Structure 1
């Protein structure tokens, strides 16, 4: 026939072989993660080499079939995904240069150490010592000392190294007919071939900035409220009209706002909900936690999870005989194998993370019927949101009342709603602008349209005019401050956080409106609603065979990102702030200078 049947049979053979090899490599990786040995490291290297060689050979084999005369869609999508060789276009010299430069990134971050002069022989690493000296203190002198010292010797080492990295990335983009590496990152949101569902690589920046422009007033008001709280608390150092310097944000680089919760609560006398006391007084363990989690999931409507998990799981750390990392993760193995690796501790956040990982496993289990290539989410944002839906839903006091943990003696009023919404707002609206800022910065620096010799000055100005944070001390052009983050050093996409935050609220509104659970938005319980589960699964089954817009249409009915659910969630808190903080100064002055 034509090349259509050729592509079909080749894809069948590739599906089989890739399935087998991927299963081998993933099982080896799981075995290493459970128990760490040097021979396991050698096995890791061998499996990685085999997978890389197989992918290279199969991509070179697939490059024969052109995409011009293919009329199907799934076959075209698979061929488009597979045909892209990746880094093979570059010569071996620059290929190994890139490998070594990523190795330098990993070494300077993981093994990067700034050591206290008090104990030069036994001191703290980037974690957890820096975090506990930056977010668990009151004196400002050591705070500013650490703030200056962290980049006093780390930023210097990487600026020429980062320049080499960015020029090599520009060559990488040029080799594959891409305008910039930012286009390479944005390509995950690109879909073509469908009329009315077309999404280009340009509209993303415009609609993201439009959403941020819509959300700006709430963030401004919350920042003004926190600044007023700081002035009423500790005015001896910060000028009453000046902006908020970053070193007072608790985190070393200024990412989250949760750790300021000790100096933000308006309702100090009101006790926040804490189920840990009843959790320990009733002898709760990980097994019962996951049992009730799967009971909740089957209450929603999704099927019970595999039995082979239970006899092939590691939930409780088996003493100290063997040493292994217990960082909570959900592993997809293939061939009907899914696993969870986490060390169970008795705390509410562990409960929420257990729900999160169970949701992740559910989403992974959903699209097992799809072929091997199409076994992924519609984009890089669906996983986190579809996992965090249950985490957001299970934190309501109504759910705790229903499950039987909290005593029904607790009354529900406006005060608890205000406290809960304050916590959630500090979690969300404090990290949305930072994410947008970092992603936009990396976007126009990888496009290469901006000059070179005053990057720090421009970056500080455009931070001050947007996020309203002023530097404590001037920085020269040799510094490389935005490289202190883990993600920027290891080439990770940072835009998935904005998308996750918007999409989770879209999902919550669209799944509680159909749930007919009348009341406030934050008091929505997904459990005992089979129709909501079916509505979720009618899209959660697709995977990535269809455009992400078609996916978002099937559960929400909207074709893009919208801020309205997010504004609806914070409606009570927004009303409280507007009614109470009218007498306080709002906004950041544009004339302040340190």
Structure 2
């Protein structure tokens, strides 16, 4: 009768055909990751190309239904996915050139290497060679050579390729009614047509700016703690008031301080929680670790797994002849068929990794009943943040003592919790401004505020101001540091890490309140709390059918990102950092550099 039946009928036609087609590509990827061969990679690529072609052919009818007078949010969200053209707006020459740029940029990133000036015949590749130098090795020269030569060998080669990527992508986004490809990434959280829950694209830039100022009190104290500790290892290069060198952060990109835990132990004489021996003594295996991990999910009140889930999952690498991908990855094969790939070992490192991938399944399995176009997450933050809150509560010693891994005689004290708490801050607190730094720089590059020649100049400027980091050797305009990152060269969004981090503690504070927990969040454990899982499943089942702000309003107590649950998590850490920073300077000084004279 009316026009409404066209969209309601067409989406049902797409949701029927695109469902099996998408699964044919997903199961083909499962078959490839389970057996890396020449036949499976072709089935994976032939299936993906087939489904991708189906999306463009269906966009013809999607654009013939204007959403101007339509108030149905379900019809609006589903058609907007197909109504957009994306890279199809430009000619094949510009689209093919873009793919050649990313394929060329990804290859130069993967094939990077550095050998010593004294030993040219042993050049170490990006992985595992150079990564261990920034992570494990404590030598000042090995970390400096790996950093500077990487920027010269890989950073310079990726500088010119990054130009057409920014230029070609800006033309793509601008044709799709965007300001730039930076705003294109900000469109993920877009919400239009809802009273009290609308969200503009530019609001993300204000959220990271506001929350960064609220993270600064915790970041400035930890930075002084890390500088004071690293100054003991490198006193002839690090000033007690200056900045931290870039090659002493812990990685080849300056994102995490997790590798600096050995150099920044709060109490190297006190013990820590580790059940690697308890599981081996209790005769645990890859299946029992997963099976006992499921008891945590059912205890909190979340749905249990099926027989097809466990029977068809991968627990180990099936030989070198049929070598599978041992990377943890939660798979949604479709039609209720969910599986996980992991080469699990008996250790606490894989104990929490099991809950992480199992947490991803609880996300996807919740909204599995939604339509195909709506059977996805509302944003990038909700996908990965829900997986961490379940594993972190499992890492709490209260759960381990209940299951029987950590013995009950283990003493718990504030001195011991700071070891686990500050180790986490090196990963969280030492990463929050770095993502805000990168995405702020990248967002300005897509918009065009920073000239192409001033990349290294403005990048080094932001490093001293935002994070307080300085390079080991000065770089001229021919360098391009952030383009050498995996997410940048492979066309990925890194702002999700910042949003996922703040969303992680927001959901944790919501579930810790659902567990009737008191005190800081670092000692929180939601085990055996049936209301905890019930509160989460009410949110996971939404998928992308409702606004993302609505899921946060009735769960975590806000519509945007917030630092309130971060400080409560690191509440006693702020006191500890305050005492250790008594003989140092909170914050940093942009006038100091390791190559100063």
Superposition TM-score, scaled by structure 1 size: 0.96
Describe the shift of the 1:32–1:117 C-alpha distance in structure 2 as closer, same or farther (beyond 3 A): farther
Indicate conservation of the 8 Å contact 2:242/2:590, yes or no: no
Q: CA–CA distance in 1 between the matches of 2:209 and 2:563?
A: 12
Q: CA–CA distance in 2 between the matches of 1:269 and 1:187?
A: 49
Q: CA–CA distance in 1 between the matches of 2:520 and 2:157?
A: 52
Q: CA–CA distance in 1 between the matches of 2:381 and 2:191?
A: 15
Moved more, 230-239 or 95-104: 230-239
Describe the shift of the 1:316–1:592 C-alpha distance in structure 2 as closer, same or farther (beyond 3 A): closer
Q: CA–CA distance in 1 between the matches of 2:591 and 2:93?
A: 51
Cα shift at 1:106:
2.5
What CA deviation, in whole Å up to 9, does each residue of 1:93-112 have, x standing for no partner?
A: 21221222222123222344
Residue aligning to 1:572 = 572
Please give the secondary structure, in 1, of the residue aligned with 2:265: coil
Alignment of 1:210-221 (within 5 A): 210-221=210-221
Moved more, 549-558 or 431-440: 549-558
What CA deviation, in whole Å up to 9, does each residue of 1:122-173 have, x standing for no partner?
A: 7532001001223332332232222211122222222222212221122212
**Is it true that 1:541 corresponds to 2:538 in the alignment?**
no
Describe the shift of the 1:517–1:144 C-alpha distance in structure 2 as closer, same or farther (beyond 3 A): closer
Please give the secondary structure, in 1, of the residue aligned with 2:310: helix
Describe the shift of the 1:322–1:196 C-alpha distance in structure 2 as closer, same or farther (beyond 3 A): same
Residue aligning to 1:332 = 332
Q: Which runs of 5+ in 2 are unaligned?
A: none
Cα shift at 1:464:
0.5
Q: CA–CA distance in 1 between the matches of 2:561 and 2:332?
A: 29
Describe the shift of the 1:14–1:271 C-alpha distance in structure 2 as closer, same or farther (beyond 3 A): same
Q: CA–CA distance in 1 between the matches of 2:120 and 2:451?
A: 40
What CA deviation, in whole Å up to 9, does each residue of 1:527-548 have, x standing for no partner?
A: 2222222221211111111100
Cα shift at 1:239:
3.7
Indicate conservation of the 8 Å contact 2:315/2:342, yes or no: yes
Describe the shift of the 1:207–1:283 C-alpha distance in structure 2 as closer, same or farther (beyond 3 A): same
What CA deviation, in whole Å up to 9, does each residue of 1:467-508 have, x standing for no partner?
A: 111222211111111111100001101111111111111111
What CA deviation, in whole Å up to 9, does each residue of 1:340-361 have, x standing for no partner?
A: 0010122212111101000111
Describe the shift of the 1:593–1:280 C-alpha distance in structure 2 as closer, same or farther (beyond 3 A): closer
Describe the shift of the 1:396–1:474 C-alpha distance in structure 2 as closer, same or farther (beyond 3 A): same
Q: CA–CA distance in 2 between the matches of 1:208 and 1:143?
A: 31
Cα shift at 1:45:
2.7
Cα shift at 1:234:
3.6
Describe the shift of the 1:322–1:452 C-alpha distance in structure 2 as closer, same or farther (beyond 3 A): closer
Describe the shift of the 1:577–1:122 C-alpha distance in structure 2 as closer, same or farther (beyond 3 A): closer
Superposition TM-score, scaled by structure 2 size: 0.96
Indicate conservation of the 8 Å contact 1:115/1:125, yes or no: no
Cα shift at 1:521:
2.3
Please give the secondary structure, in 2, of the residue aligned with 1:287: helix
**How many equivalent pairs are there?**
594
Cα shift at 1:465:
1.5
Indicate conservation of the 8 Å contact 1:326/1:341, yes or no: yes
What CA deviation, in whole Å up to 9, does each residue of 1:400-454 have, x standing for no partner?
A: 1111111211112211122121111112100111111111110011101223333
Cα shift at 1:316:
2.2
Residue aligning to 2:112 = 112
Cα shift at 1:15:
0.7
Cα shift at 1:266:
2.6
Please give the secondary structure, in 2, of the residue aligned with 1:154: helix
What CA deviation, in whole Å up to 9, does each residue of 1:28-82 have, x standing for no partner?
A: 1111111122122222232122112211101123221111232321011111122
Indicate conservation of the 8 Å contact 1:374/1:544, yes or no: yes
Q: CA–CA distance in 1 between the matches of 2:417 and 2:317?
A: 37
Moved more, 364-373 or 446-455: 446-455
Moved more, 229-238 or 47-56: 229-238
Q: CA–CA distance in 1 between the matches of 2:569 and 2:52?
A: 46
Indicate conservation of the 8 Å contact 2:362/2:540, yes or no: no
Taking only aligned residues, the RMSD between alpha carbons, in angstroms, comes to 1.8
What CA deviation, in whole Å up to 9, does each residue of 1:189-230 have, x standing for no partner?
A: 110111111111122211221110011011111111121122
Please give the secondary structure, in 1, of the residue aligned with 2:77: helix
Describe the shift of the 1:239–1:520 C-alpha distance in structure 2 as closer, same or farther (beyond 3 A): closer
Residue aligning to 2:506 = 506
Q: CA–CA distance in 1 between the matches of 2:146 and 2:201?
A: 40
Residue aligning to 1:358 = 358
Indicate conservation of the 8 Å contact 2:316/2:326, yes or no: no
**Is it true that 1:16 corresponds to 2:20 in the alignment?**
no
Indicate conservation of the 8 Å contact 1:538/1:554, yes or no: no
Please give the secondary structure, in 1, of the residue aligned with 2:108: helix
Indicate conservation of the 8 Å contact 1:331/1:339, yes or no: yes
Describe the shift of the 1:229–1:122 C-alpha distance in structure 2 as closer, same or farther (beyond 3 A): closer
Describe the shift of the 1:120–1:585 C-alpha distance in structure 2 as closer, same or farther (beyond 3 A): closer
Indicate conservation of the 8 Å contact 1:113/1:125, yes or no: yes
Moved more, 520-529 or 496-505: 520-529
Moved more, 578-587 or 439-448: 578-587
Q: CA–CA distance in 1 between the matches of 2:342 and 2:574?
A: 37
Please give the secondary structure, in 2, of the residue aligned with 1:338: strand
**Is it true that 1:68 corresponds to 2:68 in the alignment?**
yes
Describe the shift of the 1:522–1:133 C-alpha distance in structure 2 as closer, same or farther (beyond 3 A): closer
